[PDB]
């Protein structure tokens, strides 16, 4: 059934699984028209499909051309997400196919179940976790590839860089969710924490800076402080 805090270790067992987050598939700017009405303009989006054990990210870029002359775009976006996840599963060799797909939003369940009828043994599950995957577009190199796309494209990343050489996948996932939660809560302050020190850079083949183990402890503490500081401002507490 639904994935929660009771079954958190399940994310890092040896059964292949993917998280699917559709938050950034359909993205718009809202603006005034010359007549003083309001209009939307779509910008490029992405499906965020992540193996939480390996860090493998299947970033399907959704180019604005897929919306052209379509109606009910917020509904279509869920079905287009399910279509592309189904296509990704069919493209993988059998031994690489997931045994479970966890959707971050319950509105993805029926569209994904219907697209995956051919895969009755792949479980489609919701989660009770509030995961900050919407903040993916705050990771500069992911934002850059989405915005530059001139056509539909799939780009493969490891969202953990080389962290799994030093830490477990449980710890890597905890670090990722803390970074993404901080970027979601106060993007400018989170990016300042990550990039302020110019002597620590991001390798060409990485997404995050090349922090030592002790520097990651400092960064993680500064991210927790940012989240608490922001919670104190929201609620005046």
């Amino acid at each position: 059934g639904a994935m929660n805090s009771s079954n958190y270790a399940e994310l890092f067992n040896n059964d292949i699984k993917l998280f699917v987050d559709d938050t950034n598939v359909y993205r718009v700017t809202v603006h005034k028209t010359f007549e003083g009405n309001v209009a939307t303009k779509a910008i490029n989006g992405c499906i965020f499909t992540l193996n939480p054990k390996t860090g493998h990210l299947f970033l399907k870029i959704i180019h604005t051309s897929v919306w052209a002359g379509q109606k009910r775009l917020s509904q279509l976006a869920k079905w287009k997400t399910a279509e592309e996840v189904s296509a990704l599963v069919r493209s993988l060799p059998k031994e690489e196919q997931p045994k479970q797909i966890i959707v971050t939003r319950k509105a993805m369940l029926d569209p994904l179940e219907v697209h995956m009828l051919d895969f009755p043994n792949i479980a489609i599950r919701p989660t009770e976790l509030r995961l900050p995957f919407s903040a993916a577009m705050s990771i500069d190199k992911l934002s850059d590839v989405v915005m530059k796309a001139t056509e539909p494209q799939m780009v493969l990343f490891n969202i953990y860089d080389d962290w799994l050489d030093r830490i477990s996948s449980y710890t890597a996932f905890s670090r990722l969710t803390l970074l993404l939660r901080a970027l979601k809560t106060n993007e400018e302050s989170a990016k300042m924490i990550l990039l302020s020190d110019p002597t620590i850079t991001i390798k060409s083949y990485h997404l995050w800076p090349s922090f030592t183990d002790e520097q990651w402890i400092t960064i993680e503490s500064q991210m927790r402080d940012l989240i608490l500081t922001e919670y104190g401002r929201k609620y005046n507490v």
């Binding site: 029926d110 219907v114 009828l117 051919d118």
Partner: protein, 300 residues
């Protein structure tokens, strides 16, 4: 007018005949039901006074044979049986009628209720849903499961309703996932009507039979099938105008007949709210919507 004589009534029982019901006392001199209208299927149904568990009964058509009821003290139920000897049967019925030991099917001349509930129901279609080919009549009870219920366990005692499953490869053409899930017209018109039922009459016959088994036996699987066949039409953007007009009549008479005090167990809130207020056909069921709003406004 045809007759279903009873050997005796050895146990206290409520007897149903179609939408009517009569209480019979233990060892009361009751010997059956006369003046049953020719031209319709009928159902004769039972609920024992000393154990309201298992409602059960028999679908039959007096045009297809001479039927009578006899209590079986081993199996503890009233059984329908066929009498092949015409002259014996006529002689028993004549004797019981002369002694006025039979109740009369109490049809008001103005009253089209039973026709309106069974318009599309035919015995040959009942006998394909309820498989017992050695009898011309069909036994149904409260506990019998459907083929679809058994998929999710004795197959010989099952209701073989047509399986309807909105999240099945039968309902969804590869490549038309969103189209077929949001608009069930393909599934209704090509798969079900053209493919399985052959015509709207057979589809409505099964829908009407499902409703009657739900109402008369409290058969849960029958209730599921009735709602699934309503929802499949209401969820289709493309339905022939004659089918919508007829569905409105069919449902109106079903909602009219339903006991008021059974609405909480016989009516699915989600399906009815969807069909009347959200679906493609939300504006196509005027008669049904008016009776539902006036009789069961709490469900909505």
């Amino acid at each position: 007018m045809n007759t279903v004589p009873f050997t005796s009534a050895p146990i206290e029982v409520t007897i149903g005949i179609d939408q009517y019901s009569f209480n019979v006392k233990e060892n009361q001199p009751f010997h059956g039901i006369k003046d049953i209208p020719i031209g319709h299927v009928h159902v004769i149904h039972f609920q024992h006074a000393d154990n309201s568990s298992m409602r059960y009964g028999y679908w039959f058509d007096c045009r297809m044979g001479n039927f009578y009821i006899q209590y079986d003290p081993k199996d503890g139920l009233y059984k329908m049986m066929e009498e092949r000897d015409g002259a014996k049967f006529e002689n028993i019925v004549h004797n019981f009628k002369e002694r006025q030991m039979m109740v009369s099917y109490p049809k008001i001349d103005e009253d089209d209720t039973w026709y309106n509930l069974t318009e599309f129901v035919q015995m040959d279609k009942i006998r394909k849903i309820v498989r017992k080919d050695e009898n011309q009549f069909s036994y149904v009870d409260s506990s019998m499961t459907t083929v679809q219920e058994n998929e999710l366990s004795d197959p010989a005692h099952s209701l073989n309703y047509t399986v309807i499953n909105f999240k099945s490869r039968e309902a969804i053409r590869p490549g038309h996932e969103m189209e077929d899930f949001l608009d069930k017209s393909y599934y209704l018109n090509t798969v079900m009507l053209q493919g399985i039922f052959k015509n709207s009459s057979n589809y409505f016959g099964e829908l009407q039979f499902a409703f009657l088994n739900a109402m008369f036996f409290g058969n849960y699987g029958s209730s599921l099938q009735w709602h699934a066949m309503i929802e499949l039409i209401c969820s289709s953007a493309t339905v022939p105008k004659h089918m919508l007009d007829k569905l409105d009549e069919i449902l109106y008479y079903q909602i009219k007949t339903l006991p008021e005090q059974y609405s909480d167990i016989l009516l699915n809130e989600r399906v009815w709210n969807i069909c009347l207020y959200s679906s493609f056909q939300k504006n196509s069921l005027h008669n049904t919507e008016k009776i539902m709003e006036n009789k069961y406004p709490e469900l909505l």
